[PDB]
């Protein structure tokens with residue numbers, strides 16, 4: 298597996314990430330305590346994921362750039378830009394866990410739930426964001442793609458925040474209005490909150506580093522990647538309820554938080570007026586027995602089978618899009634990524 | 641007053657800010673609801689302040705740039721960059737109010753206290769931040785100083801967040817350890833949390849737009865401006881307790897929040913072991929009667945007189961620094977700003 302190959306090299310690079318980020322302290326001992334906190338935040342929140350996004354930058358880089366230009370310096374920059382995407386991920390998740398009132402992340406207590414952290418986590422998340430641009434400046438400032446990367450990260454952050462706004466607006470706490478939960482709305486939420494930053498960004502970053510800046514090449518890459526992103530969020534929604542917290546590393550909250558989940562949207566498409574009543578009575582509440590009633594209804598409508606069938610139809614469709622839109626990029630780039638997220 | 645002149649033109653420009661920010665919606669009706677929320681957030685949180693920071697960009701621009709280069713386009717860009725600093729301010733304040741558990745801001749209820757907003761305000765704050773860079777791209781991308789402005793805003797944000805980390809670390813909730821509250825620590829907190837973004841940033845932005853990018857000119861400007869920033873935070877700390885909420889627009893929380901305020905640092909310098917006990921017993925608690933005991937001790941030590949005397953010594957010192965370090969920039973730039981914040 299081409300991700301497995303690159304992994305060990307990528308993950309060890311995090312030591313260098315932390316080192317150069319906390320040598321800002323050398324020239325200013327006055328901020329020592331802040332730099333120590335930064336290190337803690339990084340070590341807690343940027344480590345322990347699958348690294349799909351960061352590894353994708355490196356894999357795509359190695360597949361897009363002529364082996365004659367893969368010197369030690371160019372490789373260090375690739376790992377760094379990969380870690381920038383992982384820091385973006387950490388920024389979004391620390392804040393998302395606060396807003397979604399979640400308990401665990403990646404198999405440990407959410408950072409804001411940690412004793413003595415609490416809403417201070419808001420500033421910690423913003424620091425993670427800031428570190429992206431410090432890394433970009435330190436490693437990439439004299440490269441021709443520097444400004445393109447800066448604008449890409451900024452734009453991806455804006456899109457993600459717009460998506461989060463839609464997520465939160467569609468799920469007002471205490472106000473169960475199931476008519477809002479349409480497929481059209483679902484698709485817009487996930488495109489913005491997940492697809493751009495999780496799928497387009499890491500490949501686009503590699504493309505810029507390879508000198509592929511053409512409007513057309515990026516537009517074609519998007520057509521494939523945003524579709525993969527939709528599937529990825531749908532899988533996340535399924536896993537919120539039907540996943541084993543021991544494997545996912547996080548306790549589900551979509552029902553309690555009144556979210557426009559793929560599951561609730563599919564339920565509303567199949568529900569008799571009497572099933573609709575059950576949903577309306579038990580959705581968006583914290584009571585464990587009410588959540589259990591919604592899961593039992595999902596199970597009745599065979600939603601887990603409907604998801605299985607969506608996964609298969611989706612894989613076939615993404616493969617068709619790769620056949621059409623990959624060129625002039627190597628299909629391997631997209632095939633590797635697809636194999637990582639479906640199987 | 642040269643701020644008063646420029647004001648009406650600057651403030652009316654906010655209509656154009658909001659318009660171009662919410663025409664992102666024209667090409668994507670799917671995110672309409674998010675764009676409506678963005679508009680609300682802007683109108684609530686970017687309006688109602690003194691605009692000292694944003695006006696400073698415009699004033700300095702008009703004083704630094706040859707009147708022959710102050711066309712309508714260059715002026716529109718100046719107003720925009722001014723509004724970018726006001727958006728940065730709004731980002732920091734929305735988040736700061738959450739973290740500091742504050743009640744009002746600029747004479748209205750804090751955004752996160754508004755019914756139906758709550759911790760969703762975390763994402764709203766991040767959107768304010770994102771809008772800075774959208775404005776910079778839309779108005780300034782083809783100008784020679786574009787990248788310098790982008791790096792300036794990013795770096796100022798990082799410094800501010802480091803400062804906020806020190807603020808929050810020095811004020812752990814429920815853990816009153818008054819020995820931490822030294823002048824040396826106070827000075828480091830305020831330099832980072834306030835001085836860079838409030839004083840250096842707006843002048844530096846004008847300098848870059850005027851083509852003054854020299855290391856030396858910026859280093860000299862900092863020497864003056866960071867000192868002004870220290871005074872400005874000290875005045876803020878005094879006003880938290882001794883200001884009239886009807887004028888300041890915000891209810892004070894420093895005592896309740898266990899903060900390393902200039903006032904508590906000055907108290908510890910003057911206090912008998914028996915006054916020290918009083919402080920230690922009543923500081924960092926929410927009880928109105930305990931807060932009242934701390935204010936009465938401050939009044940005993942004549943802290944309000946000590947502040948008056950600091951204000952005067954500080955004005956004289958800043959004026960001495962202007963005499964030394966302003967050149968080759970016009971002293972008016974710094975004098976105008978000083979007159980705005982002292983009187």
Ligand SMILES: O=P(O)(O)C(O)(Cc1cccnc1)P(=O)(O)O
Pocket residue numbers: 389390393397399457461490491533537547
């Ligand atoms: O990991 P989570 O919390 O299940 C999630 O995927 C996290 C997340 C944050 C931001 C953007 N996309 C996904 P969410 O959308 O809250 O279900």
Ligand SMILES: O=P(O)(O)C(O)(Cc1cccnc1)P(=O)(O)O
Pocket residue numbers: 732733736740742800804833834876880890
């Ligand atoms: O307006 P406030 O809340 O009194 C304050 O000045 C706001 C603030 C936020 C961020 C940086 N500097 C000041 P704080 O430091 O919390 O006392």
Ligand SMILES: C=C(C)CCOP(=O)(O)OP(=O)(O)O
Pocket residue numbers: 345346347348349386403491495529530533
């Ligand atoms: C956008 C989503 C669905 C958040 C989870 O992403 P991942 O499942 O890739 O989380 P980590 O590997 O980074 O933990």
Ligand SMILES: C=C(C)CCOP(=O)(O)OP(=O)(O)O
Pocket residue numbers: 688689690691692729746834838872873876
């Ligand atoms: C950095 C500080 C002390 C926050 C308040 O700044 P201002 O007093 O300039 O607040 P507004 O005019 O923007 O309301």
Ligand SMILES: [Mg+2]
Pocket residue numbers: 393394397399
């Ligand atoms: Mg979540």
Ligand SMILES: [Mg+2]
Pocket residue numbers: 393397464
């Ligand atoms: Mg969420």
Ligand SMILES: [Mg+2]
Pocket residue numbers: 533534537
């Ligand atoms: Mg989820």
Ligand SMILES: [Mg+2]
Pocket residue numbers: 736737740742
């Ligand atoms: Mg505050």
Ligand SMILES: [Mg+2]
Pocket residue numbers: 736740807
């Ligand atoms: Mg504060």
Ligand SMILES: [Mg+2]
Pocket residue numbers: 876877880
């Ligand atoms: Mg204050």
